[PDB]
Every structure is written in C-alpha cells, then in structure tokens.
Design a protein around this nucleic acid. Sequence first.
DNA 1: GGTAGATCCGGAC
DNA 2: CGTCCGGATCTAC
Length: 251
Amino acid sequence: PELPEVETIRRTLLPLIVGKTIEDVRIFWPNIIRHPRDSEAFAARMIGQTVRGLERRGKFLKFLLDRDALISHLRMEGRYAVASALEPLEPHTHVVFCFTDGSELRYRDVRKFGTMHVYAKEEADRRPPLAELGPEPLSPAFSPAVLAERAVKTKRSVKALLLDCTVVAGFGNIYVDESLFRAGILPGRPAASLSSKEIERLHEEMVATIGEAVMLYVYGRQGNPCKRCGTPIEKTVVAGRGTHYCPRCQR
DNA sequence: GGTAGATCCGGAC
DNA sequence: CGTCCGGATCTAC
Ligand SMILES: [Zn+2]
C-alpha cells in the first residue's frame, strides 16, 4: 500500500488492538524479521507487552508497546487483519501476534516482501529502518527550500530524488509520476536543472497529490490519451522504475 | 561520501 | 516461461 493507505491502516487498526496484551507471537516465515536477527528472540521479547499506540512514518507503521516499538513495512502486498484465534488463518500469513483476549493481529503477504524490526522505543528512531528517513511530505519540515537544497547537490534525475527516502518519507512511484505530471516536469530531468519556480510548483503538487489521497493522470495509463491534452501517455524506465509521463504536458 | 548495483519475493508475462 | 518488477537496505565501486 501507498502512504495514504498506510495512514488509513494506522487509523483503523489502532482501536482494534489498543490496550491488548501479547500472549504469543507465531512466525511462519522468519526472514520477515530483521531485528533482532533471531526470530525466536523477536517473539520472546514481545510476549507480555501491551499495545499502547500506532504511529506512521513514511510507509512504516510503528506499533508502540510497553518497552518496545515494532516497526513494520508492508511493501506492495502486505496486509494486517485482526481476527479470532479460533478461525483458520488466511493464505500467506507469515506472522501472528496472539492477544490474551483470544484475538490476533495477523500479517499476510503473498510476496513475502515486508519487514519487521523490534527495538526499545527510545532506540527505534535512531536505528534501521527509521534512522535516515526524510521529513513527512505533509509536514512543514518538507518545504520548497529543503527540496531545492537536495536537488542542487545531486547529479541525479528529479525522479530519483523524489524516490529517495532520505529526501522525503514514503513518496511512492505512483505519486512521483502523478506529482511530476501535475507540476509539468519531465521525470528524466536532472534535479539540479529545475528552476526555483519549478521547485516550488513541484513541492506544491507533491503536497496536493498526497494530501488529496489521504483526505490518475499518467500512472499505468501508457498508450492512453492524456486527460489534459490528449497526447498518448508514454512509459519508460527512470531510476530503475516504470515511469509514466505526458511528453507534451511535461517539460 | 554519493551513488549504482545487488538483494529479497512470487505472480504474471 | 526465464525474466520482470516494486521499496528500501546493504555493499562496494
Ligand atoms: Zn498531456
């Protein structure tokens, strides 16, 4: 899921697990667990902790417990569900947190691609994967001035810049293509080639696109007419990713 | 120290 | 049906 979907998950999941105490943690694909390296240690440390909150940073969910934070990334296909311990698990369930009330928080992923890290709460923000995360795209800390500073110091494309999690947190491939289209900027443009007016227009569209979705012009629309000018949308590879643009609207 | 390339994964061509 | 593809490391020029 993208950042707006992660925010929805954070909002809806919290009341379903807040105040529940972990009684067991079952791990069916150990590779999901990244810290501690031993999944038996990951399971053992969670037991007896109560869920106190749920925050989001970028596309990461941070489950706040008594002493620990569990930091979770779903990638494209991960999903959480809260359900009864009496019912059969859905396919591709890799990690289950069993609560003392007979309910469970279940993690499901066909692609087996998500990650989980557990640290003492106070350590979480200074260790992987949160450690070098950039500002929230909807926060004042992400300003056109911060964006200009990163753009001018790199040789990379503007698309590669926006994909960099140290520049802005959790801004997905879909939103990068959509924001660049709305801003009228080609995704292959060197980031340092952007004018001051382009930078602020880009920031503005980034904030609008992501802000709208939390409260498509190009992505996946290749070979189809641009909704603004009727030019067929093109697809290319930029920064190793599928990249969608209108070659007339974007410059 | 910036940055491309390697790495993980399975459903879909 | 070997290869393609997302995000965010981690590795190593
Ligand atoms: Zn157009």
